[PDB]
Amino acid sequence: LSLTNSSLMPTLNPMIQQLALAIAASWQSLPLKPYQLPEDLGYVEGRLEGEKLVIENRCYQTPQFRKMHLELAKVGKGLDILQCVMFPEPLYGLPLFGCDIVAGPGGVSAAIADLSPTQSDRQLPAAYQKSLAELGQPEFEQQRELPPWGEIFSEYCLFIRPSNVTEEERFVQRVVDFLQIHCHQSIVAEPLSEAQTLEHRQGQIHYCQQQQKNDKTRRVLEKAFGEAWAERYMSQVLFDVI
Numbered sequence: 001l002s003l004t005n006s007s008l009m010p011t012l013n014p015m016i017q018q019l020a021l022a023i024a025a026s027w028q029s030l031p032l033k034p035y036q037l038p039e040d041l042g043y044v045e046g047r048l049e050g051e052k053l054v055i056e057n058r059c060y061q062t063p064q065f066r067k068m069h070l071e072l073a074k075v076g077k078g079l080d081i082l083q084c085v086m087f088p089e090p091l092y093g094l095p096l097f098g099c100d101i102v103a104g105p106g107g108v109s110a111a112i113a114d115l116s117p118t119q120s121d122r123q124l125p126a127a128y129q130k131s132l133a134e135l136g137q138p139e140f141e142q143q144r145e146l147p148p149w150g151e152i153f154s155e156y157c158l159f160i161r162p163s164n165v166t167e168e169e170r171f172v173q174r175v176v177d178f179l180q181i182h183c184h185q186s187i188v189a190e191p192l193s194e195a196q197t198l199e200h201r202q203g204q205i206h207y208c209q210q211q212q213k214n215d216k217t218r219r220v221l222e223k224a225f226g227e228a229w230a231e232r233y234m235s236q237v238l239f240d241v242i
C-alpha cells in the first residue's frame with residue numbers, strides 16, 4: 001500500500017494518483033493480510049495488434065473484508081485507470097465500496113464511486129443511510145447516467161465527468177468520506193444470522209454478475225489480451241462469484 005514501489009503511479013492522471021493515495025491511506029492501519037489473486041497475480045502486461053495494457057494489482061483481506069482490490073492500469077500513453085472494490089465478508093453485512101476512474105490526455109472521462117447494497121431490499125443499512133445523507137447532495141456539472149447493469153449501485157452512486165479541478169477534488173473528498181463511513185461501520189458491525197449471511201452473499205454474487213456485463217472494461221482487456229483472457233480476468237480476478 002506504499003505506492004512508493006509502483007511503476008505506474010508517477011505517470012498516472014493526478015486525480016487517479018490522489019485517489020490511490022486516499023484508498024491506500026484508508027487501508028494502511030487495518031489488520032491486513034495479503035490476498036492471493038489467481039496465479040498470485042501482481043503486475044501484468046499484454047499487447048496484441050494495438051496498444052499495450054499494463055496493470056498493477058494489489059489485494060488484501062481483513063476479517064470484515066473478504067477481498068480488498070486496488071488496480072492501477074495504463075493503455076499505451078492515452079488511457080489511465082484506477083479500479084477498487086472492497087468485497088465484504090457477508091457475515092458482517094457491509095455494503096460494497098467500489099470506485100472506477102478512467103482518464104485520457106484531455107482529463108478524467110469517468111469517475112464512479114459507490115457504497116453498493118447487498119440487502120435483498122436493495123437498500124443500504126440504516127446507519128449508512130443516515131451518515132450518507134448528512135454529507136449533503138454534491139453538485140457536479142456533468143452527470144452521466146448509469147447503464148442498465150448499473151441497477152446494482154445505490155442512490156448515492158457518483159458517476160460524472162469532472163468539469164474542473166474543484167470537481168476533481170470534490171469527488172476525491174466524497175470518496176474519502178465514503179471510506180471513513182465504511183471503515184467506521186465495519187468496527188460497529190456484528191456477525192449476522194445464517195439467513196442474513198446468505199442474503200448478503202446473494203447480493204454480492206449479483207453485484208459481481210452485473211459488473212461482468214460492463215463491455216467498456218471488457219473491450220479494453222480484449223484488445224490487449226483477447227477474449228479468453230478477458231473472460232478469465234473479469235470472472236476470476238475482478239468480479240469473482242463466491
Ligand SMILES: C=CC1=C(C)/C(=C/c2[nH]c(/C=C3N=C(/C=C4\NC(=O)C(C)=C4C=C)C(C)=C\3CCC(=O)O)c(CCC(=O)O)c2C)NC1=O
Nearest residue numbers: 081083084085098099100102109110112147216217220221
Ligand atoms: C482493468 C480494469 C478496468 C478497465 C479496463 C476499465 C475500463 C473502463 N471502464 C469504463 C466505464 C465504467 N466503469 C464503471 C464502473 C465500475 N467499473 C468497476 O470495475 C467498478 C468497481 C465500477 C463501479 C464502482 C461504469 C458504471 C462505467 C460506465 C460504463 C458505460 O458507460 O457503459 C470505461 C469507459 C470510460 C468512459 O466512458 O469515460 C473504460 C475504458 N475499468 C476498469 O476498472
